[PDB]
Design a protein around this ligand. Structure first.
Ligand SMILES: OC[C@H]1CNC[C@@H](O)[C@@H]1O[C@@H]1O[C@H](CO)[C@@H](O)[C@H](O)[C@H]1O
Ligand SMILES: OC[C@H]1CNC[C@@H](O)[C@@H]1O[C@@H]1O[C@H](CO)[C@@H](O)[C@H](O)[C@H]1O
Ligand SMILES: [Ca+2]
Ligand SMILES: [Zn+2]
Length: 528
Protein backbone atom coordinates (compact mmCIF):
# COMPACT_ATOMS: atom_id res chain seq x y z
CA UNK A 1 0.00 0.00 0.00
CA UNK A 2 1.70 3.18 -1.34
CA UNK A 3 1.77 6.35 -3.49
CA UNK A 4 2.07 5.95 -7.28
CA UNK A 5 3.67 9.00 -8.93
CA UNK A 6 6.44 10.16 -11.33
CA UNK A 7 9.65 9.09 -9.49
CA UNK A 8 11.88 11.13 -11.86
CA UNK A 9 10.04 14.40 -11.14
CA UNK A 10 7.83 17.23 -12.39
CA UNK A 11 8.27 20.33 -14.47
CA UNK A 12 7.67 23.76 -12.79
CA UNK A 13 5.14 24.68 -15.58
CA UNK A 14 3.68 21.21 -16.05
CA UNK A 15 0.89 18.91 -14.83
CA UNK A 16 1.55 17.27 -11.46
CA UNK A 17 -0.41 14.23 -10.33
CA UNK A 18 -0.16 11.28 -7.89
CA UNK A 19 -2.32 8.17 -7.59
CA UNK A 20 -3.34 5.98 -4.61
CA UNK A 21 -5.72 3.01 -4.12
CA UNK A 22 -8.44 4.47 -1.92
CA UNK A 23 -12.13 4.03 -1.01
CA UNK A 24 -13.00 7.73 -0.39
CA UNK A 25 -11.48 11.22 -1.03
CA UNK A 26 -8.58 12.03 1.37
CA UNK A 27 -6.87 15.34 2.28
CA UNK A 28 -3.18 15.61 1.17
CA UNK A 29 -0.19 17.96 1.56
CA UNK A 30 3.17 18.77 -0.02
CA UNK A 31 5.85 19.83 2.45
CA UNK A 32 9.45 21.18 2.21
CA UNK A 33 12.33 18.84 3.48
CA UNK A 34 11.97 20.55 6.93
CA UNK A 35 8.17 19.81 6.96
CA UNK A 36 6.32 23.10 6.18
CA UNK A 37 3.06 22.65 4.18
CA UNK A 38 3.13 24.40 0.75
CA UNK A 39 0.14 22.83 -1.06
CA UNK A 40 -3.13 21.21 0.07
CA UNK A 41 -5.82 19.44 -1.87
CA UNK A 42 -8.33 16.58 -1.85
CA UNK A 43 -8.02 13.25 -3.68
CA UNK A 44 -10.76 12.49 -6.28
CA UNK A 45 -12.05 9.24 -7.93
CA UNK A 46 -10.89 8.18 -11.47
CA UNK A 47 -11.88 4.53 -11.84
CA UNK A 48 -12.06 1.59 -9.45
CA UNK A 49 -9.75 1.89 -6.41
CA UNK A 50 -7.92 4.74 -8.11
CA UNK A 51 -7.82 8.25 -6.66
CA UNK A 52 -5.73 11.12 -7.99
CA UNK A 53 -4.15 14.16 -6.39
CA UNK A 54 -3.37 17.07 -8.68
CA UNK A 55 -0.73 19.58 -7.36
CA UNK A 56 -0.05 21.46 -10.70
CA UNK A 57 -0.38 24.93 -9.03
CA UNK A 58 2.74 24.26 -6.91
CA UNK A 59 5.27 26.21 -9.02
CA UNK A 60 8.19 26.75 -6.56
CA UNK A 61 10.92 24.18 -7.52
CA UNK A 62 12.33 21.87 -4.86
CA UNK A 63 12.29 18.45 -3.21
CA UNK A 64 8.91 18.09 -1.50
CA UNK A 65 7.41 15.46 0.77
CA UNK A 66 3.96 14.48 -0.36
CA UNK A 67 1.75 13.06 2.44
CA UNK A 68 -1.64 11.36 1.96
CA UNK A 69 -3.16 9.35 4.82
CA UNK A 70 -0.17 7.87 6.75
CA UNK A 71 1.78 7.36 3.49
CA UNK A 72 4.81 9.49 2.43
CA UNK A 73 6.62 10.04 -0.91
CA UNK A 74 9.51 12.24 -1.99
CA UNK A 75 8.63 14.22 -5.18
CA UNK A 76 10.82 16.65 -7.25
CA UNK A 77 9.92 19.96 -8.99
CA UNK A 78 12.52 21.39 -11.43
CA UNK A 79 12.47 23.57 -14.61
CA UNK A 80 14.33 20.62 -16.41
CA UNK A 81 13.35 17.55 -14.28
CA UNK A 82 13.73 15.15 -17.26
CA UNK A 83 17.06 16.39 -18.71
CA UNK A 84 19.12 13.71 -16.88
CA UNK A 85 16.81 10.78 -17.92
CA UNK A 86 16.74 12.14 -21.53
CA UNK A 87 20.57 12.24 -21.62
CA UNK A 88 20.73 8.63 -20.27
CA UNK A 89 18.04 7.47 -22.78
CA UNK A 90 20.10 8.99 -25.58
CA UNK A 91 23.42 7.49 -24.25
CA UNK A 92 21.82 3.97 -24.33
CA UNK A 93 22.26 4.10 -28.13
CA UNK A 94 26.02 4.70 -27.59
CA UNK A 95 26.16 1.74 -25.10
CA UNK A 96 24.59 -0.45 -27.81
CA UNK A 97 27.43 0.35 -30.24
CA UNK A 98 28.85 -2.66 -32.24
CA UNK A 99 32.53 -2.85 -33.37
CA UNK A 100 33.49 0.38 -31.57
CA UNK A 101 35.80 0.65 -28.52
CA UNK A 102 33.73 2.11 -25.64
CA UNK A 103 36.31 3.72 -23.28
CA UNK A 104 35.98 3.87 -19.44
CA UNK A 105 36.11 7.75 -19.61
CA UNK A 106 32.80 7.58 -21.53
CA UNK A 107 31.14 4.22 -20.66
CA UNK A 108 32.37 3.72 -17.08
CA UNK A 109 31.80 0.23 -15.61
CA UNK A 110 30.08 -0.91 -18.86
CA UNK A 111 33.07 -0.13 -21.09
CA UNK A 112 34.33 -2.75 -23.58
CA UNK A 113 36.48 -3.48 -26.64
CA UNK A 114 35.34 -3.75 -30.28
CA UNK A 115 32.83 -6.60 -30.65
CA UNK A 116 31.62 -8.50 -33.77
CA UNK A 117 34.64 -7.32 -35.89
CA UNK A 118 34.67 -10.45 -38.22
CA UNK A 119 32.88 -10.37 -41.68
CA UNK A 120 29.46 -12.02 -42.24
CA UNK A 121 28.60 -14.78 -44.78
CA UNK A 122 25.71 -14.05 -47.10
CA UNK A 123 23.20 -16.93 -46.40
CA UNK A 124 23.27 -19.80 -48.94
CA UNK A 125 26.47 -18.40 -50.61
CA UNK A 126 30.26 -18.38 -49.99
CA UNK A 127 30.28 -14.53 -50.25
CA UNK A 128 31.38 -12.56 -47.17
CA UNK A 129 30.71 -8.88 -46.34
CA UNK A 130 31.83 -6.36 -43.73
CA UNK A 131 28.74 -4.82 -42.04
CA UNK A 132 30.31 -3.13 -39.00
CA UNK A 133 29.00 -0.53 -36.59
CA UNK A 134 25.38 0.11 -35.77
CA UNK A 135 23.56 -0.89 -32.61
CA UNK A 136 22.95 -4.19 -30.84
CA UNK A 137 19.17 -4.37 -31.30
CA UNK A 138 18.18 -5.13 -27.70
CA UNK A 139 19.30 -7.68 -25.00
CA UNK A 140 20.80 -9.73 -27.85
CA UNK A 141 23.69 -8.65 -30.17
CA UNK A 142 21.76 -8.95 -33.43
CA UNK A 143 21.53 -6.08 -35.89
CA UNK A 144 18.09 -5.98 -37.55
CA UNK A 145 17.27 -3.66 -40.46
CA UNK A 146 13.46 -3.33 -39.97
CA UNK A 147 13.44 -2.12 -36.24
CA UNK A 148 16.63 -0.07 -36.90
CA UNK A 149 14.69 2.06 -39.46
CA UNK A 150 12.18 3.02 -36.70
CA UNK A 151 14.94 3.94 -34.15
CA UNK A 152 16.60 6.29 -36.76
CA UNK A 153 13.20 7.75 -37.93
CA UNK A 154 12.34 8.63 -34.31
CA UNK A 155 15.67 10.35 -33.44
CA UNK A 156 15.59 12.36 -36.67
CA UNK A 157 11.94 13.35 -35.88
CA UNK A 158 13.02 14.38 -32.27
CA UNK A 159 15.79 16.66 -33.69
CA UNK A 160 13.40 18.17 -36.26
CA UNK A 161 10.72 18.90 -33.63
CA UNK A 162 12.69 19.51 -30.39
CA UNK A 163 16.35 20.59 -31.13
CA UNK A 164 16.43 23.09 -28.22
CA UNK A 165 15.68 20.33 -25.59
CA UNK A 166 18.17 17.94 -27.24
CA UNK A 167 20.90 20.64 -27.15
CA UNK A 168 21.03 20.30 -23.30
CA UNK A 169 22.10 16.61 -23.42
CA UNK A 170 25.46 15.03 -24.15
CA UNK A 171 26.02 11.57 -25.77
CA UNK A 172 29.33 9.59 -25.77
CA UNK A 173 30.79 12.59 -27.65
CA UNK A 174 34.38 11.18 -27.68
CA UNK A 175 33.47 8.01 -29.72
CA UNK A 176 31.88 9.99 -32.60
CA UNK A 177 33.63 11.86 -35.46
CA UNK A 178 34.47 15.64 -35.22
CA UNK A 179 33.03 18.30 -35.99
CA UNK A 180 30.21 17.41 -33.60
CA UNK A 181 26.65 17.44 -34.96
CA UNK A 182 23.58 18.17 -32.73
CA UNK A 183 23.15 15.36 -30.09
CA UNK A 184 20.45 13.20 -31.81
CA UNK A 185 22.13 13.41 -35.25
CA UNK A 186 25.54 12.48 -33.75
CA UNK A 187 23.99 9.35 -32.10
CA UNK A 188 21.87 8.40 -35.22
CA UNK A 189 24.77 8.76 -37.83
CA UNK A 190 26.35 5.48 -36.51
CA UNK A 191 23.13 3.47 -37.30
CA UNK A 192 22.67 5.22 -40.68
CA UNK A 193 26.38 4.45 -41.60
CA UNK A 194 25.83 0.75 -40.66
CA UNK A 195 22.45 0.61 -42.52
CA UNK A 196 24.26 1.56 -45.78
CA UNK A 197 26.53 -1.57 -45.50
CA UNK A 198 23.31 -3.66 -45.53
CA UNK A 199 22.37 -2.65 -49.08
CA UNK A 200 23.41 -5.13 -51.84
CA UNK A 201 25.44 -3.02 -54.39
CA UNK A 202 24.45 -5.51 -57.11
CA UNK A 203 20.62 -5.25 -56.80
CA UNK A 204 19.86 -2.44 -54.30
CA UNK A 205 18.12 -4.92 -52.01
CA UNK A 206 18.66 -4.78 -48.25
CA UNK A 207 19.62 -7.75 -46.01
CA UNK A 208 16.94 -8.31 -43.32
CA UNK A 209 19.59 -8.81 -40.59
CA UNK A 210 23.17 -9.64 -39.51
CA UNK A 211 23.20 -12.07 -36.59
CA UNK A 212 25.03 -15.19 -35.29
CA UNK A 213 22.98 -18.38 -36.29
CA UNK A 214 21.37 -18.41 -32.81
CA UNK A 215 21.15 -16.57 -29.43
CA UNK A 216 24.35 -16.93 -27.34
CA UNK A 217 24.08 -17.43 -23.51
CA UNK A 218 22.59 -14.54 -21.49
CA UNK A 219 25.98 -14.31 -19.69
CA UNK A 220 27.97 -13.41 -22.89
CA UNK A 221 30.10 -10.23 -22.86
CA UNK A 222 29.91 -8.37 -26.27
CA UNK A 223 33.58 -9.24 -27.19
CA UNK A 224 33.31 -12.89 -26.08
CA UNK A 225 30.47 -13.55 -28.63
CA UNK A 226 32.49 -15.13 -31.45
CA UNK A 227 30.07 -17.35 -33.40
CA UNK A 228 30.03 -16.75 -37.25
CA UNK A 229 27.91 -13.80 -38.43
CA UNK A 230 25.33 -14.45 -41.16
CA UNK A 231 23.55 -11.97 -43.44
CA UNK A 232 19.95 -13.27 -43.57
CA UNK A 233 18.45 -12.93 -47.10
CA UNK A 234 17.26 -9.67 -48.70
CA UNK A 235 13.64 -8.94 -47.68
CA UNK A 236 10.98 -6.54 -49.06
CA UNK A 237 10.34 -4.86 -45.63
CA UNK A 238 14.05 -4.38 -44.81
CA UNK A 239 14.42 -2.71 -48.25
CA UNK A 240 11.29 -0.59 -47.90
CA UNK A 241 11.96 0.56 -44.28
CA UNK A 242 15.61 1.29 -45.35
CA UNK A 243 14.48 3.48 -48.31
CA UNK A 244 12.15 5.38 -45.95
CA UNK A 245 14.72 5.99 -43.14
CA UNK A 246 17.45 6.84 -45.73
CA UNK A 247 15.36 9.52 -47.53
CA UNK A 248 14.40 11.02 -44.14
CA UNK A 249 18.17 11.11 -43.24
CA UNK A 250 18.93 12.71 -46.66
CA UNK A 251 16.70 15.73 -45.72
CA UNK A 252 17.89 16.08 -42.14
CA UNK A 253 21.62 15.77 -42.79
CA UNK A 254 21.63 18.20 -45.81
CA UNK A 255 22.97 21.20 -43.74
CA UNK A 256 25.18 19.03 -41.44
CA UNK A 257 26.83 16.32 -43.55
CA UNK A 258 26.16 16.88 -47.28
CA UNK A 259 28.24 13.77 -48.38
CA UNK A 260 26.22 11.46 -46.04
CA UNK A 261 22.95 13.23 -47.13
CA UNK A 262 23.77 12.60 -50.85
CA UNK A 263 24.91 8.98 -50.08
CA UNK A 264 21.53 8.41 -48.27
CA UNK A 265 19.35 9.86 -51.10
CA UNK A 266 20.97 7.62 -53.80
CA UNK A 267 20.80 4.55 -51.50
CA UNK A 268 17.04 5.26 -51.05
CA UNK A 269 16.39 5.54 -54.80
CA UNK A 270 18.23 2.24 -55.63
CA UNK A 271 16.27 0.59 -52.76
CA UNK A 272 13.00 1.95 -54.30
CA UNK A 273 14.08 0.58 -57.74
CA UNK A 274 14.41 -2.84 -55.98
CA UNK A 275 10.81 -2.56 -54.56
CA UNK A 276 9.15 -2.18 -58.00
CA UNK A 277 11.08 -5.14 -59.48
CA UNK A 278 10.23 -7.51 -56.59
CA UNK A 279 7.13 -9.15 -54.98
CA UNK A 280 5.83 -8.34 -51.45
CA UNK A 281 7.23 -11.48 -49.78
CA UNK A 282 7.30 -11.62 -45.94
CA UNK A 283 10.50 -12.59 -44.23
CA UNK A 284 10.88 -16.01 -42.61
CA UNK A 285 13.91 -17.17 -40.67
CA UNK A 286 15.89 -19.54 -42.96
CA UNK A 287 17.04 -22.97 -41.63
CA UNK A 288 19.63 -22.63 -38.88
CA UNK A 289 18.92 -18.93 -38.14
CA UNK A 290 17.05 -18.82 -34.78
CA UNK A 291 17.48 -15.09 -33.90
CA UNK A 292 14.68 -12.44 -33.98
CA UNK A 293 12.55 -12.92 -37.08
CA UNK A 294 10.86 -9.44 -37.25
CA UNK A 295 8.20 -10.79 -39.64
CA UNK A 296 5.23 -8.92 -41.13
CA UNK A 297 2.69 -10.23 -43.66
CA UNK A 298 1.42 -6.70 -44.44
CA UNK A 299 3.92 -4.77 -46.59
CA UNK A 300 1.85 -1.92 -48.14
CA UNK A 301 2.35 0.29 -45.06
CA UNK A 302 6.21 0.03 -45.69
CA UNK A 303 5.69 0.98 -49.42
CA UNK A 304 3.52 3.97 -48.21
CA UNK A 305 6.34 5.18 -45.88
CA UNK A 306 9.11 4.67 -48.55
CA UNK A 307 6.93 6.58 -51.17
CA UNK A 308 6.03 9.47 -48.80
CA UNK A 309 9.63 9.71 -47.53
CA UNK A 310 10.82 10.12 -51.17
CA UNK A 311 7.86 12.49 -51.84
CA UNK A 312 9.09 14.73 -48.94
CA UNK A 313 12.80 14.31 -49.97
CA UNK A 314 12.35 15.24 -53.68
CA UNK A 315 9.30 17.50 -53.30
CA UNK A 316 8.08 16.05 -56.60
CA UNK A 317 4.29 15.91 -57.30
CA UNK A 318 4.87 12.69 -59.37
CA UNK A 319 5.26 10.68 -56.11
CA UNK A 320 1.67 11.65 -54.92
CA UNK A 321 0.41 9.43 -57.81
CA UNK A 322 1.73 6.46 -55.69
CA UNK A 323 1.18 7.85 -52.08
CA UNK A 324 -2.48 8.99 -52.37
CA UNK A 325 -3.94 5.51 -53.33
CA UNK A 326 -1.88 3.94 -50.47
CA UNK A 327 -3.17 6.68 -48.13
CA UNK A 328 -6.73 5.57 -49.01
CA UNK A 329 -6.15 1.96 -47.67
CA UNK A 330 -7.51 0.78 -44.26
CA UNK A 331 -3.99 0.06 -42.87
CA UNK A 332 -3.46 0.79 -39.10
CA UNK A 333 -2.00 4.33 -38.87
CA UNK A 334 0.77 3.22 -36.47
CA UNK A 335 4.49 4.00 -35.68
CA UNK A 336 6.14 0.62 -36.06
CA UNK A 337 8.03 -1.52 -35.92
CA UNK A 338 5.66 -3.64 -38.19
CA UNK A 339 2.86 -1.12 -38.85
CA UNK A 340 4.64 2.04 -40.07
CA UNK A 341 1.88 3.89 -42.07
CA UNK A 342 1.90 6.93 -39.67
CA UNK A 343 5.50 7.71 -40.72
CA UNK A 344 4.25 7.87 -44.29
CA UNK A 345 1.21 9.93 -43.18
CA UNK A 346 3.59 12.38 -41.44
CA UNK A 347 6.00 12.58 -44.44
CA UNK A 348 3.02 13.23 -46.83
CA UNK A 349 1.50 15.94 -44.55
CA UNK A 350 4.96 17.70 -44.11
CA UNK A 351 5.48 17.98 -47.92
CA UNK A 352 4.68 21.34 -49.70
CA UNK A 353 0.89 21.60 -50.42
CA UNK A 354 1.56 22.30 -54.17
CA UNK A 355 2.89 18.73 -54.81
CA UNK A 356 -0.19 17.02 -53.23
CA UNK A 357 -4.03 16.93 -53.76
CA UNK A 358 -5.50 19.52 -51.34
CA UNK A 359 -8.58 17.24 -51.08
CA UNK A 360 -6.63 13.93 -50.28
CA UNK A 361 -4.62 16.06 -47.81
CA UNK A 362 -7.80 17.15 -45.96
CA UNK A 363 -9.12 13.51 -45.90
CA UNK A 364 -5.73 12.35 -44.47
CA UNK A 365 -5.81 15.26 -41.87
CA UNK A 366 -9.41 14.26 -40.95
CA UNK A 367 -8.60 10.52 -40.50
CA UNK A 368 -5.69 11.42 -38.15
CA UNK A 369 -8.03 13.67 -36.09
CA UNK A 370 -10.53 10.74 -35.67
CA UNK A 371 -7.56 8.43 -34.79
CA UNK A 372 -6.45 10.91 -32.05
CA UNK A 373 -10.05 11.19 -30.69
CA UNK A 374 -10.10 7.36 -30.29
CA UNK A 375 -6.75 7.47 -28.38
CA UNK A 376 -8.12 10.46 -26.32
CA UNK A 377 -11.34 8.45 -25.48
CA UNK A 378 -9.16 5.53 -24.13
CA UNK A 379 -7.06 7.98 -21.99
CA UNK A 380 -10.28 9.61 -20.64
CA UNK A 381 -11.48 6.19 -19.36
CA UNK A 382 -8.02 4.93 -18.14
CA UNK A 383 -7.37 5.87 -14.40
CA UNK A 384 -3.73 6.80 -15.37
CA UNK A 385 -4.90 8.87 -18.37
CA UNK A 386 -2.91 6.88 -20.93
CA UNK A 387 -4.30 5.96 -24.40
CA UNK A 388 -4.37 2.21 -23.41
CA UNK A 389 -6.92 -0.69 -23.14
CA UNK A 390 -6.17 -4.06 -21.38
CA UNK A 391 -5.60 -5.84 -24.73
CA UNK A 392 -2.88 -3.24 -25.71
CA UNK A 393 -0.56 -4.69 -22.97
CA UNK A 394 1.44 -6.84 -25.36
CA UNK A 395 5.16 -7.47 -25.93
CA UNK A 396 6.73 -4.00 -25.70
CA UNK A 397 3.53 -2.28 -24.37
CA UNK A 398 5.75 0.73 -23.32
CA UNK A 399 6.46 1.30 -27.03
CA UNK A 400 2.68 1.00 -27.81
CA UNK A 401 2.06 3.66 -25.09
CA UNK A 402 5.01 5.86 -26.25
CA UNK A 403 4.11 5.66 -29.99
CA UNK A 404 0.54 6.74 -29.06
CA UNK A 405 1.87 9.72 -27.00
CA UNK A 406 4.21 10.42 -29.99
CA UNK A 407 1.20 10.29 -32.42
CA UNK A 408 -0.36 13.36 -30.64
CA UNK A 409 2.92 15.32 -30.74
CA UNK A 410 3.75 14.75 -34.39
CA UNK A 411 0.23 16.03 -35.37
CA UNK A 412 0.87 19.38 -33.63
CA UNK A 413 3.33 20.04 -36.54
CA UNK A 414 0.83 19.29 -39.40
CA UNK A 415 -2.02 21.51 -38.05
CA UNK A 416 -3.69 18.72 -36.03
CA UNK A 417 -3.81 20.28 -32.53
CA UNK A 418 -5.69 17.89 -30.24
CA UNK A 419 -6.46 19.51 -26.77
CA UNK A 420 -5.25 16.23 -25.19
CA UNK A 421 -1.69 16.17 -26.72
CA UNK A 422 0.24 17.50 -23.70
CA UNK A 423 -1.76 15.70 -20.99
CA UNK A 424 -1.26 12.39 -22.83
CA UNK A 425 2.57 13.07 -23.07
CA UNK A 426 2.77 13.95 -19.34
CA UNK A 427 0.69 10.82 -18.35
CA UNK A 428 2.92 8.57 -20.57
CA UNK A 429 6.14 9.92 -18.85
CA UNK A 430 4.41 9.55 -15.36
CA UNK A 431 3.49 5.89 -16.18
CA UNK A 432 7.04 5.11 -17.47
CA UNK A 433 8.49 6.59 -14.28
CA UNK A 434 6.32 4.78 -11.68
CA UNK A 435 2.70 5.95 -12.07
CA UNK A 436 1.31 2.47 -12.80
CA UNK A 437 -0.27 -0.33 -10.56
CA UNK A 438 3.21 -1.88 -9.86
CA UNK A 439 4.80 1.43 -8.81
CA UNK A 440 7.50 0.47 -11.35
CA UNK A 441 9.97 2.88 -13.00
CA UNK A 442 10.36 1.17 -16.41
CA UNK A 443 13.80 2.79 -17.03
CA UNK A 444 17.08 1.47 -15.56
CA UNK A 445 19.00 3.71 -13.15
CA UNK A 446 16.08 6.10 -12.45
CA UNK A 447 13.50 6.64 -9.72
CA UNK A 448 12.95 4.85 -6.34
CA UNK A 449 11.94 1.60 -8.04
CA UNK A 450 14.31 1.40 -11.06
CA UNK A 451 14.74 -1.66 -13.31
CA UNK A 452 17.66 -3.62 -11.65
CA UNK A 453 17.60 -6.93 -13.67
CA UNK A 454 16.82 -6.39 -17.42
CA UNK A 455 17.23 -9.03 -20.19
CA UNK A 456 20.39 -7.34 -21.43
CA UNK A 457 23.55 -9.48 -22.15
CA UNK A 458 26.14 -6.73 -21.29
CA UNK A 459 24.24 -6.03 -17.99
CA UNK A 460 23.92 -9.78 -17.08
CA UNK A 461 27.50 -10.75 -18.24
CA UNK A 462 29.33 -8.01 -16.37
CA UNK A 463 29.95 -8.10 -12.61
CA UNK A 464 28.85 -4.51 -11.86
CA UNK A 465 25.45 -5.22 -10.02
CA UNK A 466 23.75 -2.14 -11.53
CA UNK A 467 22.60 -2.48 -15.19
CA UNK A 468 23.48 0.06 -17.92
CA UNK A 469 21.38 3.24 -17.03
CA UNK A 470 18.72 4.82 -19.30
CA UNK A 471 17.26 1.60 -20.75
CA UNK A 472 13.46 1.44 -21.27
CA UNK A 473 12.02 -2.03 -20.75
CA UNK A 474 9.30 -3.61 -22.90
CA UNK A 475 6.88 -3.56 -19.97
CA UNK A 476 3.77 -5.55 -18.91
CA UNK A 477 2.74 -8.26 -21.48
CA UNK A 478 -0.56 -10.10 -20.79
CA UNK A 479 0.34 -13.00 -23.16
CA UNK A 480 3.09 -14.33 -20.79
CA UNK A 481 5.50 -15.24 -23.64
CA UNK A 482 8.41 -16.53 -21.54
CA UNK A 483 8.79 -19.22 -18.81
CA UNK A 484 9.26 -16.71 -15.91
CA UNK A 485 6.09 -14.80 -16.98
CA UNK A 486 4.10 -18.10 -17.47
CA UNK A 487 5.34 -19.12 -13.94
CA UNK A 488 5.04 -15.92 -11.87
CA UNK A 489 2.40 -13.87 -13.79
CA UNK A 490 -0.65 -16.09 -14.58
CA UNK A 491 -3.95 -14.58 -13.35
CA UNK A 492 -2.50 -11.04 -13.05
CA UNK A 493 -4.32 -8.06 -14.75
CA UNK A 494 -2.71 -6.65 -17.98
CA UNK A 495 -0.86 -3.72 -16.31
CA UNK A 496 0.63 -6.04 -13.63
CA UNK A 497 1.93 -8.66 -16.16
CA UNK A 498 5.55 -7.40 -15.60
CA UNK A 499 8.49 -9.08 -13.78
CA UNK A 500 11.96 -7.46 -13.04
CA UNK A 501 13.82 -10.70 -13.86
CA UNK A 502 16.71 -11.18 -16.41
CA UNK A 503 15.20 -14.28 -18.07
CA UNK A 504 11.82 -12.53 -18.79
CA UNK A 505 12.50 -11.33 -22.35
CA UNK A 506 8.72 -10.82 -23.03
CA UNK A 507 8.36 -8.17 -20.20
CA UNK A 508 11.99 -7.15 -19.25
CA UNK A 509 14.03 -6.81 -22.46
CA UNK A 510 15.40 -3.41 -23.60
CA UNK A 511 15.60 -2.24 -27.31
CA UNK A 512 16.72 0.60 -29.58
CA UNK A 513 13.17 1.14 -30.87
CA UNK A 514 11.73 1.39 -27.28
CA UNK A 515 14.29 4.05 -26.21
CA UNK A 516 13.74 6.03 -29.45
CA UNK A 517 9.98 7.08 -28.89
CA UNK A 518 10.86 7.72 -25.18
CA UNK A 519 13.53 10.20 -26.41
CA UNK A 520 10.89 11.91 -28.67
CA UNK A 521 8.25 12.06 -25.83
CA UNK A 522 10.65 13.27 -23.08
CA UNK A 523 12.14 15.96 -25.42
CA UNK A 524 8.55 17.12 -26.27
CA UNK A 525 7.78 17.63 -22.53
CA UNK A 526 11.00 19.55 -21.92
CA UNK A 527 10.54 21.79 -25.04
CA UNK A 528 6.88 22.65 -24.07
O1 LIG B 1 12.52 -14.61 -27.78
C1 LIG B 1 13.71 -14.49 -28.44
C2 LIG B 1 14.69 -13.48 -27.77
C3 LIG B 1 14.25 -11.99 -27.71
N1 LIG B 1 15.57 -11.24 -27.89
C4 LIG B 1 16.83 -11.65 -27.16
C5 LIG B 1 16.86 -13.14 -26.76
O2 LIG B 1 17.75 -13.34 -25.67
C6 LIG B 1 15.49 -13.81 -26.50
O3 LIG B 1 15.88 -15.19 -26.48
C7 LIG B 1 16.24 -16.38 -26.23
O4 LIG B 1 17.33 -16.04 -25.35
C8 LIG B 1 17.21 -16.83 -24.15
C9 LIG B 1 17.44 -16.04 -22.81
O5 LIG B 1 18.66 -16.37 -22.37
C10 LIG B 1 17.72 -18.25 -24.46
O6 LIG B 1 17.04 -18.90 -23.48
C11 LIG B 1 16.76 -18.83 -25.59
O7 LIG B 1 17.21 -20.22 -25.81
C12 LIG B 1 16.35 -17.85 -26.77
O8 LIG B 1 15.01 -18.04 -27.27
O1 LIG C 1 12.46 -8.23 -27.43
C1 LIG C 1 13.05 -7.28 -28.34
C2 LIG C 1 13.80 -8.08 -29.46
C3 LIG C 1 15.23 -8.61 -29.15
N1 LIG C 1 15.92 -9.13 -30.40
C4 LIG C 1 15.13 -10.21 -31.09
C5 LIG C 1 13.62 -9.81 -31.34
O2 LIG C 1 12.84 -11.00 -31.55
C6 LIG C 1 12.99 -9.21 -30.07
O3 LIG C 1 11.68 -8.78 -30.41
C7 LIG C 1 10.46 -8.55 -30.48
O4 LIG C 1 10.18 -9.84 -31.04
C8 LIG C 1 8.87 -10.38 -30.80
C9 LIG C 1 8.88 -11.89 -31.19
O5 LIG C 1 8.61 -12.03 -32.56
C10 LIG C 1 7.82 -9.42 -31.41
O6 LIG C 1 6.79 -9.96 -30.70
C11 LIG C 1 8.03 -8.04 -30.68
O7 LIG C 1 6.97 -7.15 -31.04
C12 LIG C 1 9.46 -7.45 -30.90
O8 LIG C 1 9.78 -6.35 -30.05
CA1 LIG D 1 3.97 -3.59 -42.28
ZN1 LIG E 1 28.77 -6.06 -31.46
Amino acid sequence: KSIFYNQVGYLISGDKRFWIQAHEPQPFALRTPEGQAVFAGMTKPVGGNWYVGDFTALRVPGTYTLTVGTLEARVVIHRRAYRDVLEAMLRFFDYQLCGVVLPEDEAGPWAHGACHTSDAKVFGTERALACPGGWHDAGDYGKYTVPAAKAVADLLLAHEYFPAALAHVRPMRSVHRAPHLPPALEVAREEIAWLLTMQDPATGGVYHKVTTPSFPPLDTRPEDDDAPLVLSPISYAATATFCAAMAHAALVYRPFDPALSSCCADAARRAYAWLGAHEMQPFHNPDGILTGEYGDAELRDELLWASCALLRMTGDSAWARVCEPLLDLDLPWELGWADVALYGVMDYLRTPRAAVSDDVRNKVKSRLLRELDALAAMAESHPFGIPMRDDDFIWGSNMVLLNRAMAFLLAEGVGVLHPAAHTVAQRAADYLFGANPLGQCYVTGFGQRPVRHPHHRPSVADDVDHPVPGMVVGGPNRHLQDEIARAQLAGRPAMEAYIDHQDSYSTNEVAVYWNSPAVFVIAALLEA
